[PDB]
Amino acid sequence: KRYFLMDQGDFFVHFMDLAEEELRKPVEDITPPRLEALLELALRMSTANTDPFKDDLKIDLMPHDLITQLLSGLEAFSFDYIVKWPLSLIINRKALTRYQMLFRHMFYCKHVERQLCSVWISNKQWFAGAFTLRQRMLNFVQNIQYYMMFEVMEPTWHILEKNLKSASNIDDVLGHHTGFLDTCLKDCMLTNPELLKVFSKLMSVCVMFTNCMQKFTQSMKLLVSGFEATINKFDKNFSAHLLDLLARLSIYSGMASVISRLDFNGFYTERLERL
Amino acid sequence: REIITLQLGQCGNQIGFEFWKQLCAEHGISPEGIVEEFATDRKDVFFYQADDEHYIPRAVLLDLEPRVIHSILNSPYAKLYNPENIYLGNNWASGFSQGEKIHEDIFDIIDREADGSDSLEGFVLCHSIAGGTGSGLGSYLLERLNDRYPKKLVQTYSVFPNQDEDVVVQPYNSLLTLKRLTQNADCVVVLDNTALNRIATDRLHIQNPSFSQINQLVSTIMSASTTTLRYPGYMNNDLIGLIASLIPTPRLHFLMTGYTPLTTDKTTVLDVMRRLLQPKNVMVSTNHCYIAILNIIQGEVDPTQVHKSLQRIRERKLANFIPWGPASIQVALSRKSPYLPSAHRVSGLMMANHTSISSLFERTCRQYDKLRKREAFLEQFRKEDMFKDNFDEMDTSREIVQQLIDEYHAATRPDYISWG
Amino acid sequence: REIITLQLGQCGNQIGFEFWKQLCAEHGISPEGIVEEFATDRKDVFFYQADDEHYIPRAVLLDLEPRVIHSILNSPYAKLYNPENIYLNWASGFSQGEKIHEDIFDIIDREADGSDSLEGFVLCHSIAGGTGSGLGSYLLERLNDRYPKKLVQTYSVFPNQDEVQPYNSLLTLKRLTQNADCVVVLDNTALNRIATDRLHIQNPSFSQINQLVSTIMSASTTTLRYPGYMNNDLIGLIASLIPTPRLHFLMTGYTPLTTDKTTVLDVMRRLLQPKNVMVSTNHCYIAILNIIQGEVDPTQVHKSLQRIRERKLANFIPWGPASIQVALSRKSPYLPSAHRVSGLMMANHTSISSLFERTCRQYDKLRKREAFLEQFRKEDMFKDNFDEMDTSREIVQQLIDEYHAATRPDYISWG
Amino acid sequence: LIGKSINFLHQVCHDLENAFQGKIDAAYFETSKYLLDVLNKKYSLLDHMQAMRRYLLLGQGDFIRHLMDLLKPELVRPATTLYQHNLTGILETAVRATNAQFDSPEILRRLDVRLLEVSPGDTGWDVFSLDYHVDGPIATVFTRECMSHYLRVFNFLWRAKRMEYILTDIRKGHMCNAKLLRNMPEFSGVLHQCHILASEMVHFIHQMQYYITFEVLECSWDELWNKVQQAQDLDHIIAAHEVFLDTIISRCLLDSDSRALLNQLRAVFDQIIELQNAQDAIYRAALEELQRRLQFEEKKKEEENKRIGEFKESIPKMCSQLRILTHFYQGIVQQFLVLLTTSSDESLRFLSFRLDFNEHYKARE
């Protein structure tokens, strides 16, 4: 869980940065040997100096897209995990297939916002409604990314200890662990039975907010016009589906956090309500 | 790609120097540059990864007409840093002209430390806003970074020259240098001596010292706010995503700060969390609202009151976002270095566009209107008078800040689709 | 059959004296030539032994009328390098070679019969300066006029000081670009730029650059000062630095220049950065021989090299096997040292020739003016023909055109 | 296994009551180290393995080159000029006279020769090996098949050394054409088609020669120097040695798995080791011309202008006098180093990818 969901943040900030230009690309076109050298430099540059536990990390890639989890930069890769016998009581196929190919549905958020922000670099008249949507649609990524992982963190570890350390017996220990694993995931809407599927459709315009507007941060002289003609489109593409899909997931009576945390704003609390 | 955390002018070499001393405390470094015994950090970006752990910071040490620099260089931390970064006005035009005629070696030093990275993600100039070498030379370099490296984020960390009633040309230098921030810089973070004053009459039995003791406050605040850029966690590890979620326009880039435990010189995180929303607790100057509220808690932890934290401050509603869209409180945990002490056990801090900065911009602008109308404090020296034609450097800067006022006021309201 | 360090003039002597001190200390040998009494690297390629087992390093001087070398001549190191070696504007230097042309070969052929035989020489040398120019390009020519199959190389700093030197350097370029087997080279302006990174003064006092140069010159032969398994013969390694012997200038550097953790993954990522080259119609890298030394892991630096091949911080040319090539010598015990991995580097490169073109511009400036050819009598008997100087232009200009043409992909043919 | 392994210590070096699942497995401790002291020090294998890495494996290079350079006059001139009153004598002398004197004198003694089985063409290249011969128990490590395997390792590394000697003696004639060659400007313009062939050889083999260093020699040694001090049992050091020697043999272009490469590789090596005499035959003319221009320089310190016109007429042939040779060499180099994908998947992929370090194949092709 340290290496999934980018939690070794001091590695990952270096990771999607030094070799970014040959990781980010829209359709395949990665060069894995570059990030394999950065896997060494950026880990030693990160916190792996606290404990040298790197060797378990191995890169893995898609046999059959989503459903095994239970574009590049977008969803680029995910990491394999195998161990020797006493740890293998804990790490085994039904669990390690939630390893191997997960956090990819989290990686695309950090890519798409940072690539949108690379457009923001190319301009640090000028109708500020376009600038405000660049801020606003980005916040839709940033605060849900906060919700997806910067929510339940300590408790699951506090639970895991007092569960396993007291029990001692594999007949319950594996139940405690497999329960803990899903408990950590239940922040991440990566786990959702409806696939929250309007968000996946919204993603198709989200990437255009990066690439087509990066293209515009040349063709604006090579934002009052060719940004603007899409600002109205992005605006109510996102704001319609965004302010119905939380209501679609109105299941709960540390929990109910996805809904409570983008209810919180008060304006655009919803537009198409659950009730 | 990295943050070259520069620092310019003699006051800048107090406050940036104090920041690097506080950062070496917060990471955990003894005054020789020996790291603490656990090694927890994205180290290389901020202290350089040497062979034998000579962790030298990524900050320059430039001045004009040195008068405190030799005292700073005799301090015990003279091997915690001493690269080739130390190199040589009262009113702003002299520093501009002296820097232009001296620039062959100081900009070489800046370029060498700029080349001491993979690339730059930001040039953060620790900068006095109105002082005699922060103005002129500091502002001149702040332009030159925008002239030579225009698209990468030219940045500043600063104190707003908002003491009531030190420098003899306070508003004239301030709106001159605010042109370099609003136009030529791309993101800036700033503190206010009046907000620090009312906080001092809560935290401390203190008075006269003020500015030179605000060196401690500025530094501890700057360190504790940039935590997200320098410690690991599940999210928010990077400048490019995070700061963009605060800054829409090429103008609206003046982030400001708020901090909970003013009793500092186990404590329930519910009262810690509500305290960050109070009018008592922001360090810059109607009841203005938050465009964002970062709070990765850096102090002690409770495994279920951290669950209650956000859910409870939703209810207390002491200051709302008054937003335009998805803006809500970015709470999290953070990592903290072991082995460091603390008598008071909990802290939480935001750097964000809180909209109070709009009133502080109208404070420097009403102060400059008061200069444009009185003629008595025009400060029309011969060294400043034929340097520029019409003070396009400032009378345009009033308009460029008025644009920023028309955007911040709009950001305060739900009608942010335009100005107003 | 082994080789000798013929050392000459001013710069060449100064770096020659520095390596014959530094390398003596690098082995289990005392500064006076006595063996370190406790006694992995190879002496016999350059050393010889007294009857009484004293180490005699071979300071076989061939120089002329020195300004500064007398301090080296009148030192206790005369006893360390005992054997009879000390005996004596550009054309005065070249013609004061011509008056001794038998003896500057014959005494060295006697020294070569003092081995089983000699295969050749690695000469340290001054490009320009005064009397070291002309003379070095005479004596190294003579050696090979008499030896039509031996080796005679010329490693020499280039005195890039913004600048009669614009003639001395162009005549040294005419000679050495037709007379030198291989040339290692360094510049004072960029070494000053390195000195500003280590010391808070503009190195007013000079003659320190010797400490950086002397280990690089002898790194060029370190695959035979240490156990180099392959590419060990003198031409055995040198020829392999070269695509064609007209692209013969070998630029230089290190991983740490401030060399007073560096593990296997970072030293080579540091190395390719523009900070690490001790010199400043397109330009490419042509080779990078880095002679890595220390506590190296030889089953992971090749893996590192494989990753550096894909890191692409060294463009190289779209033609030729132009590459970065690693040469480990394991650290021998005889002395301590710091920063326990580094790659001391020599890179064959295009961009040294921009400084040759700048002094070609100075030469084109001076050729219209003629303010100083120094007007000496020996200069005026030997090189007053004014054809010899005009033929310098084509010989240097072909080196500019070939280095610029090699940046193109159609260099397969001549052009 | 306990009984088989422990008896050599006494021979040559000179459930039932439910009580099982204990010391019976653990009695191999007595084999695990006691045997390896006597079969490394009293009967020498620490000495001999040091001698393999330093001398027989070519794996220090110093002593190897020193003998070859004491005998440069008398190995190119056929090795029949050296016999029992020469070969074994000058080997042991060479170990004294070079830095290989930093080793134990009693150990140097077993470094001798092993000539090729039937080969009357005895020049110092086709037919040579600076063998290290073993009598007594350690002949189980270095048996008949194992000395055929070390003879093959010696042959590949000595033939790669003959590529170093030839391809760099070849460039020593080219360097004469840049050392003596300070009179005529245009001799790069003639000799370029051979200078760049030399680029497709010495510059190409720089990364090959240090590939042989890092892959074939250094990476082999880490398997075994970690192991000879430790590894239980001389029969299991022999097992590890058989895997180690097969690793060398499969890092080399020598294995039964990679025999297909050798016909293409020999076609590369042939236009290497045959070329020295041919490209020196070219310098016979240029040296003649240089020696003519040098005797004209000796006469000067006006009649020499016609030879420049004569060479201006001749130069176009002597340049194009290699185009066909260059590509007959290069074509089978290029096909070999891509055919090299049909063999050792780490070790020879490294050979393929190290050699074409950047844009020689995929760009010069």
DSSP string, C51-107: TTS-EE----B---S-SSTHHHHSSTHHHHT-SS-----HHHHHHHHHTTTTHHHHH
From the list C91, C62, C75, C66, the residue with the least C-alpha distance to C31 is C75
From the list A32, A27, A29, the residue with the least C-alpha distance to A15 is A32
User: Going by beta carbons, is chain C in contact with chain B, meaning 3 or more pairs sit under 8 Å apart?
Assistant: yes
**Gap between the terminal Cα atoms of chain A:** 37
Instruction: Name the residue in chain A with its Cα closest to that of C312.
Output: A34
β-partners of residue D260 are: none
Burial of B202-230, coded b for 16+ CB within 10 Å and e otherwise, reads eeeeeeeeebeebbebbbbbbbbbbbbbb
d(CA B57, CA B49): 10
User: Going by beta carbons, is chain C in contact with chain A, meaning 3 or more pairs sit under 8 Å apart?
Assistant: yes
Side chain identity, residue A179:
G
Burial of B376 (0-12, 13-18, 19+ CB in 10 A): exposed
From the list B52, B349, B36, the residue with the least C-alpha distance to B221 is B349
User: Going by beta carbons, is chain D in contact with chain A, meaning 3 or more pairs sit under 8 Å apart?
Assistant: no
CA distance A25 to chain C (A): 18
d(CA B247, CA A131): 9
Q: Is-contact C3 D172, C-beta < 8 A?
A: no
Assigned token pair, A207: 């990437």
From the list C233, C107, C252, C126, the residue with the least C-alpha distance to C180 is C126
* Pairing of the two strands B187-192 and B61-62: unpaired
Whether chain B has a CB inside 8 Å of the CB on A46: the answer is yes
Select the residue from C264, C269, C308, C309 to test the A interface by mutation, using most A Cβ atoms within 10 A.
C269
Assigned token pair, D326: 């260059």
Phi, psi of D341 (to 5 degrees): -70, -10
Q: Which method resolved this structure?
A: cryo-EM
β-partners of residue B62 are: B8, B87
Whether chain A has a CB inside 8 Å of the CB on C310: the answer is yes
Question: CA of D277: how far to CAs of A63, D79, D173, D282, D291, in Å?
Answer: 58, 18, 11, 9, 20
Whether chain B has a CB inside 8 Å of the CB on A163: the answer is no
d(CA B65, CA B375): 29
Element (H, E) at B157: strand B153-160
How many Cβ pairs within 8 Å bridge chains B and C?
20
Nearest Cβ partner for C178 among D178, D204, D219 = D178
**Which other chains touch chain D, taking contact as 3+ CB pairs less than 8 Å apart?**
C
Whether chain B has a CB inside 8 Å of the CB on A120: the answer is yes
Whether chain B has a CB inside 8 Å of the CB on A72: the answer is no
Task: Determine whether the interchain pair C262/B84 forms a contact, defined as Cβ–Cβ distance below 8 Å.
Answer: no
> From the CB of residue D300, how many other CB atoms can be counted at a distance below 10 Å?
8
Question: CA of B40: how far to CAs of A72, A136, B47, B105, C402, in Å?
Answer: 30, 33, 13, 36, 52
Phi, psi of B47 (to 5 degrees): -120, 135
Question: CA of C238: how far to CAs of C152, C221, C231, C252, D202, in Å?
Answer: 11, 8, 8, 15, 9
**Which other chains touch chain C, taking contact as 3+ CB pairs less than 8 Å apart?**
A, B, D
Element (H, E) at B254: strand B254-259
Task: Determine whether the interchain pair B301/A154 forms a contact, defined as Cβ–Cβ distance below 8 Å.
Answer: yes
Nearest Cβ partner for C229 among D169, D181, D213 = D213
Q: Is B187 helix (H, G, I), strand (E, B) or coil?
A: strand
Give the 3-state DSSP-derived string for chain A, with helices as H, strands as E and coil as C: CCCHHHCCHHHHHHHHHHCHHHCCCCCCCCCHHHHHHHHHHHHHCCCHHHCCCCCCCEEECCCCCCHHHCCCCCCCCEEECCCCHHHHCCCCHHHHCCCCCCCHHHHHHHHHHHHHHHHHHHCCCCCHHHHHHHHHHHHHHHHHHHHHHCCCCHHHHHHHHHHHHHHCCHHHHHHHHHHHHHHHHCCCCCCCCCCCCHHHHHHHHHHHHHHHHHHHHHHCCCCCCCCHHHHHHHHHHHHHHHHHHHHHCCCCCCCCHHHHHHHCCCCCCCCCCCC
Residue C299 CB partners (closer than 8 Å, separation 6+): D218, D219, D222
Whether chain C has a CB inside 8 Å of the CB on A33: the answer is yes
Q: Which residue's entry shows tokens 């020519």? A: C141
Resolution of this PDB entry, in A? 3.6
DSSP tag of B278:
S
d(CA C292, CA D285): 42
The full length of chain B comes to: 420
Assigned token pair, D4: 């088989």
Burial of A57-81, coded b for 16+ CB within 10 Å and e otherwise, reads eeeeeeeeeeeebeebbbbbbbbeb
The angle formed by the CA atoms of residues D310, D311 and D317, to the nearest 5 degrees, is 115
CB contacts, 8 Å: B108 with chain C: 196
Nearest Cβ partner for C274 among B51, B86, B115 = B115
β-partners of residue B86 are: B61
Instruction: Name the residue in chain A with its Cα closest to that of B332.
Output: A150
Please state at what angle helix A104-122 crosses helix A128-149, rounded to 10 degrees.
Answer: 150
> From the CB of residue B370, how many other CB atoms can be counted at a distance below 10 Å?
11
* Pairing of the two strands C287-294 and C329-330: parallel
CA distance C336 to chain A (A): 27
Task: Provide the sign of the torsion angle of the four alpha carbons A41, A43, A48, A53, taken in this order.
Answer: negative
Nearest Cβ partner for C310 among A31, A40, A44 = A31
Is residue C93 a known part of a binding site? no
d(CA C156, CA C12): 7
CB contacts, 8 Å: A185 with chain B: none
Phi, psi of A142 (to 5 degrees): -65, -45
CB contacts, 8 Å: B51 with chain C: 256, 261-262, 338-339
For chain D, after which residues does the C atom lie more than 2.5 Å from the next written residue's N, i.e. where is it broken?
A: 14, 301
For chain B, after which residues does the C atom lie more than 2.5 Å from the next written residue's N, i.e. where is it broken?
A: 39, 88, 165, 265, 285
d(CA C219, CA C367): 39
Phi, psi of C197 (to 5 degrees): -85, -15
Whether chain A has a CB inside 8 Å of the CB on B40: the answer is yes
Is residue B134 a known part of a binding site? yes
Torsion, Cα of C229, C232, C237, C239 (10° steps): -120
Strand positions, DSSP E, D73-204? none
d(CA D96, CA B300): 71
Is residue C130 a known part of a binding site? yes
Q: Where are the alpha helices (DSSP H) in B330-356?
A: none
Task: Determine whether the interchain pair A45/B42 forms a contact, defined as Cβ–Cβ distance below 8 Å.
Answer: yes
How many Cβ pairs within 8 Å bridge chains A and B?
197
CA distance C233 to chain D (A): 7
Task: Determine whether the interchain pair D222/C394 forms a contact, defined as Cβ–Cβ distance below 8 Å.
Answer: no
DSSP tag of C156:
E
DSSP tag of C34:
P
Q: Is-contact B331 B224, C-beta < 8 A?
A: no
CA distance C260 to chain B (A): 11
Instruction: Name the residue in chain B with its Cα closest to that of C195.
Output: B84
d(CA A11, CA A13): 6
Residue C290 CB partners (closer than 8 Å, separation 6+): C268, C271, C324, C325, C326, C327, C343, C344, C345, C346
d(CA C59, CA C81): 6
Q: Is C185 helix (H, G, I), strand (E, B) or coil?
A: coil
Is residue B138 a known part of a binding site? no
d(CA B361, CA B397): 12
d(CA D171, CA D174): 4
Residue C282 CB partners (closer than 8 Å, separation 6+): C404, C407, C408
Task: Determine whether the interchain pair C310/A40 forms a contact, defined as Cβ–Cβ distance below 8 Å.
Answer: no
Element (H, E) at D108: helix D105-108
d(CA D134, CA D115): 16
The angle formed by the CA atoms of residues C124, C125 and C131, to the nearest 5 degrees, is 145
Burial of B149-161, coded b for 16+ CB within 10 Å and e otherwise, reads beebbbbbbbbbb
Assigned token pair, A189: 């809407």
β-partners of residue A26 are: none
Is residue B348 a known part of a binding site? no
Burial of D224 (0-12, 13-18, 19+ CB in 10 A): buried
Q: Is-contact B123 B6, C-beta < 8 A?
A: yes
